Short mmCIF file of C-alpha atoms in Angstrom, two decimals:
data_model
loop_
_atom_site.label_atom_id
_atom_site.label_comp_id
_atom_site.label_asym_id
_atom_site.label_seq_id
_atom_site.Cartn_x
_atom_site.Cartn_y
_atom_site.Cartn_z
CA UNK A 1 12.09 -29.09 15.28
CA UNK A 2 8.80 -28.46 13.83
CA UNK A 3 6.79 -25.34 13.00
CA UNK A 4 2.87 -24.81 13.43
CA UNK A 5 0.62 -22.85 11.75
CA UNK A 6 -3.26 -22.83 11.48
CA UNK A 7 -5.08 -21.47 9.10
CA UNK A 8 -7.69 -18.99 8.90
CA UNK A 9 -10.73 -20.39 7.75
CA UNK A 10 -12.33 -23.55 8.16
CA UNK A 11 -12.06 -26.42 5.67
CA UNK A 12 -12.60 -30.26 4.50
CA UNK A 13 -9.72 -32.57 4.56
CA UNK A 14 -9.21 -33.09 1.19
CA UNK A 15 -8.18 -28.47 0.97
CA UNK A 16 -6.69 -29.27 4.19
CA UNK A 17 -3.61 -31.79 2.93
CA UNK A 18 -3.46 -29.51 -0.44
CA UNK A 19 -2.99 -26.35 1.67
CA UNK A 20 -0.27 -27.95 4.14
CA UNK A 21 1.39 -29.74 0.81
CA UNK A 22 1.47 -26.56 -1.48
CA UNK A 23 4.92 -25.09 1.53
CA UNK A 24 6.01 -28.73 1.45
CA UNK A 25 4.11 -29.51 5.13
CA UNK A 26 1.55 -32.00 6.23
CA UNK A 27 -1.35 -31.86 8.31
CA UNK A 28 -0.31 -31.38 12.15
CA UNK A 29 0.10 -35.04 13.37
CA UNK A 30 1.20 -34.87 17.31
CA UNK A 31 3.23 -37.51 18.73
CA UNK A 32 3.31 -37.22 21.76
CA UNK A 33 1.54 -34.67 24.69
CA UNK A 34 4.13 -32.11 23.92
CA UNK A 35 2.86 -31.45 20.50
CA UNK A 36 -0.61 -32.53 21.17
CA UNK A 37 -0.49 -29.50 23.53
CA UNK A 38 1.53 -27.23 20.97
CA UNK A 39 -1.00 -27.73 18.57
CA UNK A 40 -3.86 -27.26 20.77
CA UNK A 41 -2.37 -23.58 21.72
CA UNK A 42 -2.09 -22.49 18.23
CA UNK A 43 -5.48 -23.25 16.71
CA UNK A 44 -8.14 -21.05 17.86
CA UNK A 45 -10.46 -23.48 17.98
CA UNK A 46 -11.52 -27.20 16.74
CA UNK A 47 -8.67 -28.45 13.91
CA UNK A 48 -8.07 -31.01 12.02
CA UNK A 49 -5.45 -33.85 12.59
CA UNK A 50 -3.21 -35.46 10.47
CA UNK A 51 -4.96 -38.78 10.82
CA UNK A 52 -7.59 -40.93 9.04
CA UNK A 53 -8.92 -44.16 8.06
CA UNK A 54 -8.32 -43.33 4.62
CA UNK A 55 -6.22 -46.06 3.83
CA UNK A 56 -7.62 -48.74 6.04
CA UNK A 57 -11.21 -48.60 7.15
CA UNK A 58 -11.49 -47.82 11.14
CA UNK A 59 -7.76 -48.30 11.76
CA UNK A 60 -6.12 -44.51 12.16
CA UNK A 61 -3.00 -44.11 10.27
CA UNK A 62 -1.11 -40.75 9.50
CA UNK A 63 -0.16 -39.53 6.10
CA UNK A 64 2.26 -42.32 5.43
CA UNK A 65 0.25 -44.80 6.35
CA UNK A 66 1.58 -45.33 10.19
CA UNK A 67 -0.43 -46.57 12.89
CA UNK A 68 -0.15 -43.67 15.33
CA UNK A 69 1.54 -44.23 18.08
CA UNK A 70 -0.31 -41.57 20.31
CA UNK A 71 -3.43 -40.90 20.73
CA UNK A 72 -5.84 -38.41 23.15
CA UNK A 73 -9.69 -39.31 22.32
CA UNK A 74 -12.27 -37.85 23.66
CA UNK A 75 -14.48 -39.87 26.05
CA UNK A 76 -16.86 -41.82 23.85
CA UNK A 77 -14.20 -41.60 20.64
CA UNK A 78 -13.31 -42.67 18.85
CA UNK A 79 -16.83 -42.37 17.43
CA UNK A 80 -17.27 -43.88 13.63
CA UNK A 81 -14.14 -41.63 5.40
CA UNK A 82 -13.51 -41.09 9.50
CA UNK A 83 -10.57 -37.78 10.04
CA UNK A 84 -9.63 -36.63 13.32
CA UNK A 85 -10.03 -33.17 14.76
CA UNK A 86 -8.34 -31.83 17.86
CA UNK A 87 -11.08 -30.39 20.32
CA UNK A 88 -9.98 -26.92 22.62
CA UNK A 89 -9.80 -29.25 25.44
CA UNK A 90 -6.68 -31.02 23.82
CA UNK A 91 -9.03 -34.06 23.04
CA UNK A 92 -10.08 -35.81 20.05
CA UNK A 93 -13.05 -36.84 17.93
CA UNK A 94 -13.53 -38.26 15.45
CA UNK A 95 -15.85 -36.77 12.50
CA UNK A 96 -16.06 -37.00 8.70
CA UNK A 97 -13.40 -35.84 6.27
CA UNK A 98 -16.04 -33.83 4.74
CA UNK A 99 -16.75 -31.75 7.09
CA UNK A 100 -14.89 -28.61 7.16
CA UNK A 101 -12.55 -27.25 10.59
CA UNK A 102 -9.16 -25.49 10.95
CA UNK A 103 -6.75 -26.78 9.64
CA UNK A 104 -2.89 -26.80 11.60
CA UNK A 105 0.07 -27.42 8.89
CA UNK A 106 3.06 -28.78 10.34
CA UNK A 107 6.48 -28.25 8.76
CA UNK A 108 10.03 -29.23 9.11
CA UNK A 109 13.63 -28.36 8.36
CA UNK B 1 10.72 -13.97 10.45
CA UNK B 2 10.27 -17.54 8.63
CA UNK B 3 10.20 -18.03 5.22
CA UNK B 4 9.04 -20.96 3.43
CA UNK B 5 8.57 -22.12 -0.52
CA UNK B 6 6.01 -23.39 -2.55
CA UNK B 7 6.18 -26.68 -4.10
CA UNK B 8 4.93 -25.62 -7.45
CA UNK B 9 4.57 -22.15 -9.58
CA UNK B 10 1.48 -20.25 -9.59
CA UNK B 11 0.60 -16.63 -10.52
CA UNK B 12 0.51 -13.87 -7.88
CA UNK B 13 -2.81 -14.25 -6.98
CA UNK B 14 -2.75 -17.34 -5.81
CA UNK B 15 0.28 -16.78 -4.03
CA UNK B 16 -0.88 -14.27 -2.15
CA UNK B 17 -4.11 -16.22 -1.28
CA UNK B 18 -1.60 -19.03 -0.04
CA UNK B 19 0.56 -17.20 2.01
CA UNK B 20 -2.61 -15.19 3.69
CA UNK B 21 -4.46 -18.45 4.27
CA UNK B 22 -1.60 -19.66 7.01
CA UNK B 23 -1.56 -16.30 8.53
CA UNK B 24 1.95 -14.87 6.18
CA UNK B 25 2.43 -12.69 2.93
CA UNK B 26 4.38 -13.17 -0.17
CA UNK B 27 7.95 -12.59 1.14
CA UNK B 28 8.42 -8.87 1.16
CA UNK B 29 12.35 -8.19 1.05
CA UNK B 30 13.06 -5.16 3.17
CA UNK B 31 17.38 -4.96 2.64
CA UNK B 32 19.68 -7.05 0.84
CA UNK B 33 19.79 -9.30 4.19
CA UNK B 34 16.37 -9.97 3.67
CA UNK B 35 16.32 -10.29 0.42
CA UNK B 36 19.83 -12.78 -0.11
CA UNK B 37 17.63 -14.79 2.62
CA UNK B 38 14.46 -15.27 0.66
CA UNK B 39 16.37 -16.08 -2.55
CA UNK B 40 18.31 -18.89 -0.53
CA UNK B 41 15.02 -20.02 0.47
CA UNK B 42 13.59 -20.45 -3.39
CA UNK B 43 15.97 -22.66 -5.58
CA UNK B 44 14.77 -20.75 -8.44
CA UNK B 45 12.58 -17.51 -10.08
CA UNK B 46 10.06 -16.62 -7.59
CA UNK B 47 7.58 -13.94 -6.68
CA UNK B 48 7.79 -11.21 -4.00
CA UNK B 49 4.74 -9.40 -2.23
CA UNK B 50 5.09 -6.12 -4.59
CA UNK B 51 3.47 -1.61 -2.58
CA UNK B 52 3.43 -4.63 -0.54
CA UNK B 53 0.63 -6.47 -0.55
CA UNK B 54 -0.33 -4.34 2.15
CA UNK B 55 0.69 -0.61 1.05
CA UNK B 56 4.81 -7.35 -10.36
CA UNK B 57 7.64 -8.58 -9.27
CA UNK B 58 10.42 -11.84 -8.86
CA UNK B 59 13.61 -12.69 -7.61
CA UNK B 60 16.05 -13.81 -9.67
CA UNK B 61 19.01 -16.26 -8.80
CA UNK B 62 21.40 -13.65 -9.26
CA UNK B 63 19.08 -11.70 -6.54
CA UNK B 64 17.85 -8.91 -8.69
CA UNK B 65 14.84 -8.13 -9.51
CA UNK B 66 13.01 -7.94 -12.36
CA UNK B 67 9.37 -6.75 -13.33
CA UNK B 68 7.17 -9.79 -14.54
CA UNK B 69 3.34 -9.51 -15.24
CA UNK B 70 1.09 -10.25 -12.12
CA UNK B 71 -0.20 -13.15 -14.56
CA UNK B 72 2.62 -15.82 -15.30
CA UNK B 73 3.49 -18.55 -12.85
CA UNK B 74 6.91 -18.98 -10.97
CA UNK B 75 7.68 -20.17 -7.38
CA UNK B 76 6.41 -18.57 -3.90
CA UNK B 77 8.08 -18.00 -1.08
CA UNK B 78 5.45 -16.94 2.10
CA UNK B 79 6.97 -15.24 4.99
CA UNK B 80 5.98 -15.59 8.22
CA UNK B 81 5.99 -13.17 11.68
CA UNK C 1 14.34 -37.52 17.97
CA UNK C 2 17.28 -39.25 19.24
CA UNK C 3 20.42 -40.93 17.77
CA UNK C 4 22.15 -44.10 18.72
CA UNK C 5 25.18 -45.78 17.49
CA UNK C 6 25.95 -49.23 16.40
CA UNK C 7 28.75 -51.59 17.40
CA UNK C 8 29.86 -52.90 13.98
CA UNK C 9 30.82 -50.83 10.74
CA UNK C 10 28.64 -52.28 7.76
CA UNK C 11 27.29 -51.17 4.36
CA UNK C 12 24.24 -48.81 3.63
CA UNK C 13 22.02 -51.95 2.98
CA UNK C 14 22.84 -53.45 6.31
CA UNK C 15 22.61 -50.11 8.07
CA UNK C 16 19.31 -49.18 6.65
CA UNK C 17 17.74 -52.53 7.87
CA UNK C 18 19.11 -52.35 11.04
CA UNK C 19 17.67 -48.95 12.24
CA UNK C 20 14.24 -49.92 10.90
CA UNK C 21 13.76 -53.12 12.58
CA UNK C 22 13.79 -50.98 15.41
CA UNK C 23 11.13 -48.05 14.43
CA UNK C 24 13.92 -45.80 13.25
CA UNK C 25 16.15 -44.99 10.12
CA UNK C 26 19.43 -43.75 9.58
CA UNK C 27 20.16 -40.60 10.54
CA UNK C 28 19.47 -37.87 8.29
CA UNK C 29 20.47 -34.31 9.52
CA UNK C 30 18.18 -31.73 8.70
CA UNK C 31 19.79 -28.63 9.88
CA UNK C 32 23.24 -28.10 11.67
CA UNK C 33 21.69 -28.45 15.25
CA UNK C 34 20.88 -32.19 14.15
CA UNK C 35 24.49 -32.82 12.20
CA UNK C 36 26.07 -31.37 15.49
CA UNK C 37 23.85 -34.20 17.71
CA UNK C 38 24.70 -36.95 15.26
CA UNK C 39 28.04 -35.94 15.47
CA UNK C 40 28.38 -35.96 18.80
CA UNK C 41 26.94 -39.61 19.73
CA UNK C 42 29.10 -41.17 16.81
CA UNK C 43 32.56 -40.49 18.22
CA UNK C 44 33.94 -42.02 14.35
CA UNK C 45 32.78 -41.62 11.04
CA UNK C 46 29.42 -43.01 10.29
CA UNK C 47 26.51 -43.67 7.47
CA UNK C 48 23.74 -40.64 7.35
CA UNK C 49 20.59 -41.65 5.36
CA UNK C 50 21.28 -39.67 2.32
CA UNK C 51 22.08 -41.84 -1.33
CA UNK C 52 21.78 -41.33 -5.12
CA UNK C 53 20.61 -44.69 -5.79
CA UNK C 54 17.22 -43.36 -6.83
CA UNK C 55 18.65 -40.57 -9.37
CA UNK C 56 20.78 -36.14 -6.73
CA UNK C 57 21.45 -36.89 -3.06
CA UNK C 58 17.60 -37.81 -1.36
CA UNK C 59 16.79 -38.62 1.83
CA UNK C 60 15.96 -42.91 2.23
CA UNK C 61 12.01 -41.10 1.98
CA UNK C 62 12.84 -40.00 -1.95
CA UNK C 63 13.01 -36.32 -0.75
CA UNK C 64 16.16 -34.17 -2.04
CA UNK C 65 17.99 -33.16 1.10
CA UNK C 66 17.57 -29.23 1.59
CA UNK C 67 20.50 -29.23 3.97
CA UNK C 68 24.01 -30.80 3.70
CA UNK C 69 27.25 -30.10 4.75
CA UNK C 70 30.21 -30.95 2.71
CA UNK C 71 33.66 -31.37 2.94
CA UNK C 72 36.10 -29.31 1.37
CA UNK C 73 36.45 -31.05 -2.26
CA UNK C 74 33.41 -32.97 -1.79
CA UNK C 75 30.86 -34.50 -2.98
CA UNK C 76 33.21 -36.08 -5.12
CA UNK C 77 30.84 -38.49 -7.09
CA UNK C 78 31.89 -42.67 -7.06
CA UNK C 79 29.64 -43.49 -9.73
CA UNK C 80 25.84 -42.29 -10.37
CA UNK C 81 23.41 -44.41 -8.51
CA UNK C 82 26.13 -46.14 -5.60
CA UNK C 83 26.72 -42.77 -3.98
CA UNK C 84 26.57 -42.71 -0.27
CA UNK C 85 27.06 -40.12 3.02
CA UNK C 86 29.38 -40.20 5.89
CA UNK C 87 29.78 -37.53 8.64
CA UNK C 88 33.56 -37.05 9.90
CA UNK C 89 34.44 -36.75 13.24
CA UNK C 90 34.84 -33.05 12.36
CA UNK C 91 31.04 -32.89 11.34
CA UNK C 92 31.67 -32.48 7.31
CA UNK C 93 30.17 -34.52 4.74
CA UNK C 94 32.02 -36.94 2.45
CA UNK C 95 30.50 -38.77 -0.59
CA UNK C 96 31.78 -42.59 -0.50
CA UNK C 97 30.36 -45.99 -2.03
CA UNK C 98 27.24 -47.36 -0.12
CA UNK C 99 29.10 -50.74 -0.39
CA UNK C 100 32.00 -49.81 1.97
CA UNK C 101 31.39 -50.54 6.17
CA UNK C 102 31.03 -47.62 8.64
CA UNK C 103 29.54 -47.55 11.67
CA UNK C 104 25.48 -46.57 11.75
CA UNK C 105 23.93 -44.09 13.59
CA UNK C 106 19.99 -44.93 13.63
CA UNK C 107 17.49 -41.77 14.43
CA UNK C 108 13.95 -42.17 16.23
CA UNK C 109 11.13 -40.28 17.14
CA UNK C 110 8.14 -40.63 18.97
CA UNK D 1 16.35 -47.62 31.55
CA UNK D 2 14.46 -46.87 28.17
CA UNK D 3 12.86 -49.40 25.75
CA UNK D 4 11.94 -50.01 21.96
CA UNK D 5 10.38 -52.78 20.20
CA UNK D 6 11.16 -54.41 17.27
CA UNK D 7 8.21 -54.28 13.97
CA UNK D 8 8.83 -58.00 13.16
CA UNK D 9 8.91 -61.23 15.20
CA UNK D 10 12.52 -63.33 15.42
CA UNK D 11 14.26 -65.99 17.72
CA UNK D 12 15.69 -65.41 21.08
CA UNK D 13 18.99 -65.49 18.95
CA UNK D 14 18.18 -63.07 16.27
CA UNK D 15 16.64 -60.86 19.10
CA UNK D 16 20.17 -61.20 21.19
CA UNK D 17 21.95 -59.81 18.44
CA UNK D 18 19.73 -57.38 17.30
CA UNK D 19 19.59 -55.10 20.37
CA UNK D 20 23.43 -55.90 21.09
CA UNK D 21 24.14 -54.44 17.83
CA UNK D 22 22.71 -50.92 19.18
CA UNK D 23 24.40 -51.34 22.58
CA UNK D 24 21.50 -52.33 24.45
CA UNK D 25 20.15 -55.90 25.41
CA UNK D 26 16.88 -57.46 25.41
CA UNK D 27 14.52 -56.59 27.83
CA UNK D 28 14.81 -57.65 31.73
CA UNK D 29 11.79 -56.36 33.91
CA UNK D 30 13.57 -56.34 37.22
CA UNK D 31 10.58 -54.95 38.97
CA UNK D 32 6.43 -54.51 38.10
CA UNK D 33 7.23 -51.36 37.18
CA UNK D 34 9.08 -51.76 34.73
CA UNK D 35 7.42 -55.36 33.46
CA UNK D 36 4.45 -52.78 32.88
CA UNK D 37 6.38 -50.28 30.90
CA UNK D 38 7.89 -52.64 28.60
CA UNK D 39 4.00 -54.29 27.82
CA UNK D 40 3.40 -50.90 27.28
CA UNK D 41 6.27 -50.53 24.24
CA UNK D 42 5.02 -53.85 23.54
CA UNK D 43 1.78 -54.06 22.58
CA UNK D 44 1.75 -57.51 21.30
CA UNK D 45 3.51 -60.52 23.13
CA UNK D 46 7.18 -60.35 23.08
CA UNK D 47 10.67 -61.68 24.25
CA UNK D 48 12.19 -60.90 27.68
CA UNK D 49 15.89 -61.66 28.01
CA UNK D 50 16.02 -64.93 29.99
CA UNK D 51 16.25 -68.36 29.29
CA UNK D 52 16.75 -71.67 31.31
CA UNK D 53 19.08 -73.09 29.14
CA UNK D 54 22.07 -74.31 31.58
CA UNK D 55 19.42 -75.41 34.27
CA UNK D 56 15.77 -76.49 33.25
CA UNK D 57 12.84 -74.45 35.06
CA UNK D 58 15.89 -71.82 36.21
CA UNK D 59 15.74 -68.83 34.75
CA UNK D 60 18.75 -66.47 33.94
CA UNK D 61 18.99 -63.49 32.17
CA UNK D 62 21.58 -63.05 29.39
CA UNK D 63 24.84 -62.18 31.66
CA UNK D 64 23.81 -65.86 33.54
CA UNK D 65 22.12 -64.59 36.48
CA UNK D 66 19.59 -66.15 38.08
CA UNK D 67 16.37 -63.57 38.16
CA UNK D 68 15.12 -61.88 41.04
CA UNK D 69 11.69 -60.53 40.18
CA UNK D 70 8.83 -63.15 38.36
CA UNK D 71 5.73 -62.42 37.11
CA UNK D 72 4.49 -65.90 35.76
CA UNK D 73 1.28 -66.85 34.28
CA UNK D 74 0.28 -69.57 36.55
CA UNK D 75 3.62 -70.20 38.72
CA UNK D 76 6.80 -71.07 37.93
CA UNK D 77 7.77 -73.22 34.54
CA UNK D 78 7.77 -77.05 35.32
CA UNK D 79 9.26 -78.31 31.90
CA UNK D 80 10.45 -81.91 31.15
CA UNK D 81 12.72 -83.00 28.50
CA UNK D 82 12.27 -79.86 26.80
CA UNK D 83 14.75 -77.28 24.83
CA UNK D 84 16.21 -73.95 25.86
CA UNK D 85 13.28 -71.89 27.28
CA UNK D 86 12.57 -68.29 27.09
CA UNK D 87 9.98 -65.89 28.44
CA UNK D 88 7.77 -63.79 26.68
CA UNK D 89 5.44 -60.50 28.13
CA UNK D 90 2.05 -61.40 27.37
CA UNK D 91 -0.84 -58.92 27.07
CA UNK D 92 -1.51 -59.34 30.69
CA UNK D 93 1.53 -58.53 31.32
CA UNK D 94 2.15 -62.03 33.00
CA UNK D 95 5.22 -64.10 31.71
CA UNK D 96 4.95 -67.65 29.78
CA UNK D 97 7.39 -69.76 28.89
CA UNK D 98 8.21 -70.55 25.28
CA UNK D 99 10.80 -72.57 22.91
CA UNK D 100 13.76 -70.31 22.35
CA UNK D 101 13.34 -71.15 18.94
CA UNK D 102 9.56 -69.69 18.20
CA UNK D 103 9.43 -66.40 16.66
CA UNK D 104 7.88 -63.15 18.67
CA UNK D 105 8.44 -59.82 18.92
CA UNK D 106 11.66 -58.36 20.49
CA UNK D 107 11.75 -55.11 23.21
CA UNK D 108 15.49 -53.89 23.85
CA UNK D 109 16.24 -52.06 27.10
CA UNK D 110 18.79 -49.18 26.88
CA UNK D 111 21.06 -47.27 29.37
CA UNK D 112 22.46 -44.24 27.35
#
């Protein structure tokens, strides 16, 4: 149902979307355990999320502007432009969209 | 193996840089299979990986090929493993 | 994602709000796995979430649909902009007015 | 038994007729278990499926049973002269009684 692939070397958010968008995918934005867990195994380390506070300060929305409806933070996150990285542990932090990680694009049928 | 294609045109380099980034190559037809699948895949003129890009040219929507400078911009299809 | 039907045939507009006040959205297959699934929980013909009022068949997200599955002789256009999809018992795809009633099968996801 | 919540608040009525519509009902917590599973659908306070209409301060759920399991903030409903009643989930997860009529979220509880 949907296909995961990292990429190679790290990067900010903003060459993050661009990247996924360019093959007509979004950042990887788990649901539920399942994918938080399929995600996890295909990065090779710490990745970035599908999720910010872009659109509304300290409330974490995905790239439609959602609520998400699942969530896995870290102990002591979410910590506070906030993004959302997915730690080899499965968990989450939350760290600036500036800073640059791996990046997971998720695409679709 | 996957393929998958670009939103936009763009020349060869940066084609190649986009496929490589997520871990694929410019899609590299290896039969007519191959190749009818990666032209149903692009809904128009786009570029292939050619050597491969690994040891220029685009696929047309009557599936031949023809030979385009490295330079001008058309649609990407990456192919993935 | 999972599919449920509704009781009562009604128009696109109708449809539409009734899956979303629920979190979901009218189905919209996106490969032949999904058609089949839709297919199977409406046992009659029903409303998939694919219309021309925007233009070109899109997806209720403004997306052109990248998969469809048409009946023979279809789509066979009702007039640009009022153009809706319904899924036959047999799975195919027939082009119809977004004002006429079918029944509603509404997709979700977590 | 699986559960979904509506985004918008409505009436007991509207709510009736909304889950109905996709062969399901509004939400009856027969047991804790379940009264914590559809909180957790429901984050904010919504509308279980039973009312006191026929009988003041005796609660039935939509098919005109009288309910089993209870889970009231401070004890049972002791209403005078008042209109149909309905329960909602609250945050706590305890019930409250409220006018049919008021408007709060919806949870439907499906068996497909």
């Amino acid at each position: 149902k949907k296909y995961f692939m990292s990429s190679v070397r790290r990067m900010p958010l903003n060459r993050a979307k661009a990247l996924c968008s360019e093959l007509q995918g979004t950042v990887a934005t788990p649901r539920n355990a399942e994918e938080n867990r399929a995600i996890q195994n295909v990065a090779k380390d710490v990745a970035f999320l599908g999720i910010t506070d872009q659109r509304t300060e300290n409330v974490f929305e995905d790239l439609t502007g959602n609520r998400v409806r699942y969530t896995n933070w870290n102990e002591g996150e979410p910590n506070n432009e906030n993004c959302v990285v997915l730690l080899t542990n499965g968990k989450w932090n939350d760290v600036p969209c500036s800073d640059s990680f791996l990046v997971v694009c998720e695409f679709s049928d």
